[PDB]
Design a protein around this nucleic acid. Sequence first.
RNA 1: GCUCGCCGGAAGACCAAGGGUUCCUGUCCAACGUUAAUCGGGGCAGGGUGAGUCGACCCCUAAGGCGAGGCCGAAAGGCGUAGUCGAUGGGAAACAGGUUAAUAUUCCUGUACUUGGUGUUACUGCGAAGGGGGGACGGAGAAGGCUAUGUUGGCCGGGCGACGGUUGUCCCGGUUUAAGCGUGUAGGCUGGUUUUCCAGGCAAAUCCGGAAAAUCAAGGCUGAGGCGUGAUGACGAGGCACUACGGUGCUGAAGCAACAAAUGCCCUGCUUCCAGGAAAAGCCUCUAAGCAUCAGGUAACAUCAAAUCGUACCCCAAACCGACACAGGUGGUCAGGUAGAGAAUACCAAGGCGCUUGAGAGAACUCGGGUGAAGGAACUAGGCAAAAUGGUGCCGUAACUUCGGGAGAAGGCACGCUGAUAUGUAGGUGAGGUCCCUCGCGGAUGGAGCUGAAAUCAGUCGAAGAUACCAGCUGGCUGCAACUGUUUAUUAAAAACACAGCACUGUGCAAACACGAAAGUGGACGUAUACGGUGUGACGCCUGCCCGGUGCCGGAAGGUUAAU
RNA 2: AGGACCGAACCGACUAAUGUUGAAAAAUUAGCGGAUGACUUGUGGCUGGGGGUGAAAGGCCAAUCAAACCGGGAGAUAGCU
Lengths: 46, 93, 271, 37
Amino acid sequence: MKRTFQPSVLKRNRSHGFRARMATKNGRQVLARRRAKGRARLTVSK
Amino acid sequence: MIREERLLKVLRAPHVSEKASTAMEKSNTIVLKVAKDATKAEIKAAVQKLFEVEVEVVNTLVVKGKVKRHGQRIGRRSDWKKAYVTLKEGQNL
Amino acid sequence: AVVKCKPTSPGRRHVVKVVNPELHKGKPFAPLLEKNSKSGGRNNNGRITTRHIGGGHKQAYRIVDFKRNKDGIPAVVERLEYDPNRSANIALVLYKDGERRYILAPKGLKAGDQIQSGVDAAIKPGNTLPMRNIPVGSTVHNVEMKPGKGGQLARSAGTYVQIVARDGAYVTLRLRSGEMRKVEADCRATLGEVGNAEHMLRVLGKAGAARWRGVRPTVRGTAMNPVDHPHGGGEGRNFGKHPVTPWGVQTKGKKTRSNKRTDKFIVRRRS
Amino acid sequence: MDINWRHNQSTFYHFTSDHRISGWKETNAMYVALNSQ
RNA sequence: GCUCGCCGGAAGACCAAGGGUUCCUGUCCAACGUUAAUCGGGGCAGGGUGAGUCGACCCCUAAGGCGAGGCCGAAAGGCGUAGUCGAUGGGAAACAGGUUAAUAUUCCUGUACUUGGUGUUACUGCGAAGGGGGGACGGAGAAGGCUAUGUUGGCCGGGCGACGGUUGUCCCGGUUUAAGCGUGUAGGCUGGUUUUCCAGGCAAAUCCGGAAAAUCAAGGCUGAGGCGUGAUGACGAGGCACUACGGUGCUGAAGCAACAAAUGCCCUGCUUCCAGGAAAAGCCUCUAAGCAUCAGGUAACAUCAAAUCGUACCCCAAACCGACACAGGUGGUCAGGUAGAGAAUACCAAGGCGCUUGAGAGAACUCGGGUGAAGGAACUAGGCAAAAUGGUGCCGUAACUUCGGGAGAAGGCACGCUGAUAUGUAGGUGAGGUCCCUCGCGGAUGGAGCUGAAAUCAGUCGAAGAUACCAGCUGGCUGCAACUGUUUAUUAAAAACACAGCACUGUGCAAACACGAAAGUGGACGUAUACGGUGUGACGCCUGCCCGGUGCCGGAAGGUUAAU
RNA sequence: AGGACCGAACCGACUAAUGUUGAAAAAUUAGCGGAUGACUUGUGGCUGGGGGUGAAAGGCCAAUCAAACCGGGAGAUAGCU
């Protein structure tokens, strides 16, 4: 059956990637919480 | 021209294997590990000027590093670059 | 020429076509075409603002000359063409100085026919000229509402506007609505009536024909749940309410004009 | 194995399915309740 | 290794996405593998991915994103012009053969092609975020010409055969060759050329558009395939010499023709139909400012450059998405034989597999199937399930009907094999020869050869000739819904939703209406034959009475009536 | 010609049986509907929570939907167990 995760790298990055978190106020606050929690990978880039 | 300070840092090791060996003893090509940011003009110039031979053409691939592990600790090795340096008819090394 | 299709396969049983042998079978004139991307009924916020729109055939826009600015230069009608963006047909015309333009095609106008815009134009159907020079009681289409702006009244097929008065700087116009409106008399207008009247006689025949003009289905309000439409719910068919829009405003009677700026120009509302 | 066992015990903790008992177990409880009414 | 079975429009082959070393070799069997394991997609180590031509990057753009200024907004921020990004689309160029354990249009051999830089030489008006062309583009249908590919004959090499026969109307195998370059064909489109003039293409224009003449009747554009060359080369069934028996080298015959033939190519064509079918760059042209014995343009030759990243391997799956080595999901490409209308179906080729627990026994019972005396719905909520029907041709076919249907109504008959008509016909294709020449990829004649239905008559076999697989059960009365469609992903596919059609009502354009603190945007580059809302729901005959209540529309006299 | 007819791919999901600590958190097998269209599909884009989208089922919005998920107010409150 066709499950929910149908992967695509270009949609992974355009959607949840770094240049797209940095592109706005609230994604920068996301990166700030991931750095502050101290996190090995911030976004999902590769 | 390429400066000689750049041109010394490019070639890194001769690559020893059996594909390399049959490339030397069968098709004049010496195979050698180069700098990761080394272009084909740099490798050609560096073999022209550091082994004093005449290079016909260079073919460069980039080899991806293998994820090994020690104990239960993984790690990728490291990517390197391998240059197939096709020499002319007059060569030794 | 309207044609009833023979009833092979339902779906064709009730279709009436409006065929026109004088339309150009071929490609339109290219440098008066441009891209017309379809929207889906959705504004710059992405949201559906006008419902029921979407799909349909790909269409190219045709720059139709509504202004009719080339004054005094005659133009022969080169051909007539199908325009997908309108109810009427468009005539491709060729001015004497070698410029082609598309105009709305009036009623009698065929290929090889002289039209002429401007003040000293002859009064005959196809000639755009200001309404201080048109006689009272003449059918007139493609009417401007502000001088220099372009035609906006009576553009849809089979539609005309009658000039009934010339009191001063204004002409009283019986719009196709039935409404009497004052327009400034310097506004150009094209003589005759616009010419595909039989457009209203076609009957479409099946559901997919509506679909291919870009008209998605209309779910009626009473078939929904109360969260969706004010008509909603009820254990079999159940109306019981005064009929409203999906936003609660009364349909079936309730007047929704509020302008106050253009009420000066309305002599009598429609009836 | 321990991580997969904790997550695979954590599988039906936030479920919705009402005809299946505990999200997964098939039953006849729809007919039992429905016949009780 | 020999047999046996399974897939073969896939369970073969090649990719994209996705993964990321799973690829290949050596080595180990702890754990992983639903068992054992010497094996493995497991552990460990080593190796492996070679590009001017493939793809990305790059040039150009769609939807859409972002957006200097800007308009707007308590702040955050919204929208958006110039612009700038964004492929799933447009834009230069390589093919055959060989090779590795593992890469190959990348390496090697042979033969090519493309785009830029620079230099020389000959001629020369060049020049844009500007004008024109072009790129540039729908659905369906129909043939015609081809090819891939296949079949048969010829040729060449080999065999004459475990059991009757098999020197022949016999058996097995091979019969392959590309890009590029040259020619220009079956088609398809368009009249061509010269001169003058002009309110158009923001300016200019020799370009485009337009208006006059004059002359010629042809020119041009495009185009599959074939043919020639590439190629006296490669490949080639097989033999020969050594053989770490794994193979390794050497040598190597024929290498043709006929017919059939695509869903591929001519074809972005042609015919037709409404529902009227991207953009921008490369490309070709025109000039403006400027530069004008310079620069630049064109042509030939030479020379240099073409960087960077991807390239392993799986990819309908044990490697991706499904927690699993999961009976599920996953886009594109190639598509042989026989029978067949066919990409169905049966059996097969190439190729790949036998599904990572086995050995027995042959109880009840469960599951998947086969058959069944007599009866034949008596079962049951209900013919649920099963059984039955099932092909092609011809005959024949009712009520009712919107004249289309109903209709494949219903119901029948024929069907294999052999021989003759006819040493294979009708038809298709069509050589050599002959005739003419505007002479060749020509047309006329001619029929050799190949292919080849279908029908009748005669005979013969079986219980049965649509023999397997595949492949309608039919009829009568009636409710609802007109019809095709849509819907409760995961107990409801329906009479429900939709629908064409009808009506009412709003709406005069800065439209009503909707999203939006606003700007703005959709409505719509539309304009009342249009658009929005509401109900009803093809079609036919129709749609009666009630305005007291609630709503809406209209009226303005009087009563009451806020801020002030 | 056709929201035409029969029928594969392709899309679907009408019936039955199995399965129901499944091979599978919705499938398999045998039949079944559509199959040139209101079709189907790939790649990208847009719409967002009292909001979207809806040929309307209160359906769908990441195995979640009469108001998603995450985090916080938050140790809500619980005359109840």
